[PDB]
Design an enzyme around this catalytic site. Structure first.
Site, PDB file in Angstrom:
ATOM      1  N   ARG B  37       0.842  -1.196   0.000  1.00 21.30           N
ATOM      2  CA  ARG B  37       0.000   0.000   0.000  1.00 21.30           C
ATOM      3  C   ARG B  37       0.876   1.245   0.000  1.00 21.30           C
ATOM      4  NH1 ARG B  37      -4.064  -0.776   5.005  1.00 21.30           N
ATOM      5  NH2 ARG B  37      -4.680   1.299   4.241  1.00 21.30           N
ATOM      6  N   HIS B  96       8.894   2.716   3.382  1.00 26.32           N
ATOM      7  CA  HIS B  96       8.950   1.285   3.655  1.00 26.32           C
ATOM      8  C   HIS B  96      10.408   0.825   3.667  1.00 26.32           C
ATOM      9  CE1 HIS B  96       4.574   0.347   2.302  1.00 26.32           C
ATOM     10  NE2 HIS B  96       4.716   1.657   2.398  1.00 26.32           N
ATOM     11  N   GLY B  97      10.627  -0.367   4.214  1.00 26.24           N
ATOM     12  CA  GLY B  97      11.969  -0.913   4.277  1.00 26.24           C
ATOM     13  C   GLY B  97      11.988  -2.400   4.576  1.00 26.24           C
ATOM     14  N   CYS B 139      10.435   0.013   8.029  1.00 23.96           N
ATOM     15  CA  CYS B 139      10.327  -1.331   8.513  1.00 23.96           C
ATOM     16  C   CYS B 139      11.716  -1.923   8.511  1.00 23.96           C
ATOM     17  CB  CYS B 139       9.365  -2.065   7.586  1.00 23.96           C
ATOM     18  SG  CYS B 139       7.711  -2.149   8.233  1.00 23.96           S
TER      19      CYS B 139
END
Lengths: 293, 243
Positions: B37, B96-97, B139
């Protein structure tokens, strides 16, 4: 950003019914039972507007493709602020479908050349009392699909079933009906995608309105009922709402709107989005519509 | 006697705030990242850090949805720049990660080492001896952190010195971002910063509180827990006063 989701737990019910040509529609049905390793012959049944001219097995990818087009439509209504992250057989080896004229089923029922025999009376007897009575009625038409998923159905994919049938009378019977239970209440967990049908807020207000939504465990929660009629839309649904407070700085409130369940209609497209996720109602009936005449 | 990082410079330092929101380009290309997302709410933290490091006299320098390649360039720019008149340099990445990497709008990783080592003493002689702060909101795994019941409460210097690295979460675990309010780490980092800075407390002290808060924040849903974890190679107390 995560790959441990949906598995041996994701199985509500997904139904799509679209018009393929002039007098032909296709019905895709995916239920819990179809997705489990059955060890014995299992029987299930429902209502179809007309008779089945063919039965096939579709690919499971179909399950997620249908639940998306629908789950998304009802998602633009919610305001979830949860924390995110970063006489007419159709035999086959595995199954066996039989499509007879509603009333006929009652009179012959016992006849199990569909091989749901070894379940003997002690097993069939049940269905005549709790299901059968909710499949045949004063309108002796209403064909009853009799399916008998035999073990082996699990092997391979393509668990989804599809019914090519010919609608009698411009009627469409999206099968929501359940198995009459002693208790009196029924739990619904279904998403539906039917198209080329004319709206009908009389039977939808009736349904939605008789819906008891799940709890979010907050004293402040209030379950509102809606009836919007936007540009090319018209939604009848109920949502559970409750305001939340900040977690740090300023005193900013956060009005939630979740557990939305009802019916959404696309005035233009002429499509009908249904979503009854874990909602209860004392109303155990099918939704009947009319094909754009 | 003592020692504290000099923070006099009116314009303290820059604050490259790389806020990543749209990962569409990635949902298409990188296959694995198609069921991904967008980071909704990132904006609240972007406007949260901006507000914070504003009163702290930092010349904020915001950056849209950047892709790996752009990010690297953005960083290669503020590296050849002079920071003499600057007594501090801060960089914040939001996106994000996974295991020691930070995804970009595009969808390809970018090892943190390759980002943070871009501002060593060698690569940037201007920032040598001056505190370089990095806050990475991302993340760092797919695992959820369990939660146990406490039942209480003139010369030469090393090349990689003066480094503060704020990690939204320990490794292998997930960071939590709330669409309505913002992200835990980043929000605590501020609510705790913007309040302790007046009373003159170093960052090392402030981050200990942040670890306290996010350690209480619980993912009501999937019984989750987030545990930040900073790392520093600093030589003196880092503290920035304001008005």
């Amino acid at each position: 950003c995560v790959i441990f989701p949906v598995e041996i737990d994701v199985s509500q019910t997904i139904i799509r019914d679209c018009q393929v040509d002039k007098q032909t529609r296709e019905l895709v049905y995916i239920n819990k039972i179809m997705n489990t390793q059955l060890t014995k012959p299992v029987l299930m049944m429902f209502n179809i507007s007309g008779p089945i001219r063919s039965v096939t097995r579709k690919n499971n990818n179909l399950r997620d493709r249908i639940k998306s087009k629908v789950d998304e439509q009802f998602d633009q209504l919610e305001r979830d602020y949860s924390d995110q992250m970063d006489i007419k057989y159709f035999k086959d080896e595995h199954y066996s479908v039989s499509c007879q004229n509603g009333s006929v089923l009652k009179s012959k029922f016992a006849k199990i050349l569909k091989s749901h025999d070894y379940t003997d009376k002690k097993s069939i007897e049940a269905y005549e009392k709790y299901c059968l009575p909710k499949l045949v009625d004063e309108r002796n038409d209403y064909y009853v699909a009799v399916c008998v998923l035999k073990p082996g159905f699990e092997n391979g994919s393509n668990q989804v079933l599809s019914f090519e049938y010919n609608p009698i009378g411009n009627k469409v019977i999206v099968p929501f009906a359940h198995e009459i239970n002693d208790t009196g209440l029924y739990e619904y967990d279904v998403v539906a995608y039917v198209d080329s049908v004319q709206f009908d807020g009389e039977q939808f207000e009736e349904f939605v309105q008789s819906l008891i939504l799940p709890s979010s465990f907050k004293n402040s929660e209030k379950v509102l009922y809606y009836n919007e009629a936007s540009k090319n839309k018209s939604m009848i649904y109920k949502a559970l709402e409750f305001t939340t407070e900040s977690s740090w700085g300023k005193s900013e409130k956060y009005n939630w709107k979740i557990f939305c369940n009802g019916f959404i209609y696309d005035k233009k497209s002429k499509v009908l989005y249904v979503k009854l996720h874990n909602v209860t109602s004392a109303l155990n009936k099918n939704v009947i519509l009319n094909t754009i005449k | 006697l003592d020692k504290v990082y000099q923070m006099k410079s009116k314009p303290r330092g820059y604050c490259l705030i790389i806020n990543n929101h749209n990962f569409a380009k990635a949902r298409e290309k990188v296959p694995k990242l198609h069921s991904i997302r967008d980071r909704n709410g990132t904006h609240l933290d972007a406007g949260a850090l901006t507000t914070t490091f504003e009163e702290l006299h930092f010349e904020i320098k915001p950056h849209h949805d950047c892709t790996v390649e752009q990010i690297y360039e953005i960083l290669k720019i503020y590296q050849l720049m002079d920071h003499s008149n600057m007594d501090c340099f801060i960089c914040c990445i939001l996106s994000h990660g996974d295991k020691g990497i930070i995804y970009g709008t595009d969808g390809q990783e970018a090892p943190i080492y390759e980002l943070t080592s871009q501002f060593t003493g060698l690569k940037c002689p201007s920032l040598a001896g001056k505190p370089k702060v990095f806050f990475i909101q991302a993340c760092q795994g797919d695992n959820y952190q369990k939660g146990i019941p406490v039942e209480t409460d003139t010369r030469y210097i090393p090349d990689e010195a003066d480094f503060l690295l704020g990690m939204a979460t320990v490794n292998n675990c997930v960071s939590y971002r709330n669409p309505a309010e913002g992200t835990w780490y980043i929000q605590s980092l501020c609510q705790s910063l913007r309040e302790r800075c007046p009373r003159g407390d170093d960052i090392l002290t402030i981050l200990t509180e942040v670890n306290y808060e996010v350690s209480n924040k619980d993912d009501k849903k999937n019984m989750g827990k987030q545990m930040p974890q900073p790392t520093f190679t600093l030589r003196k107390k880092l503290v920035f006063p304001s008005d």
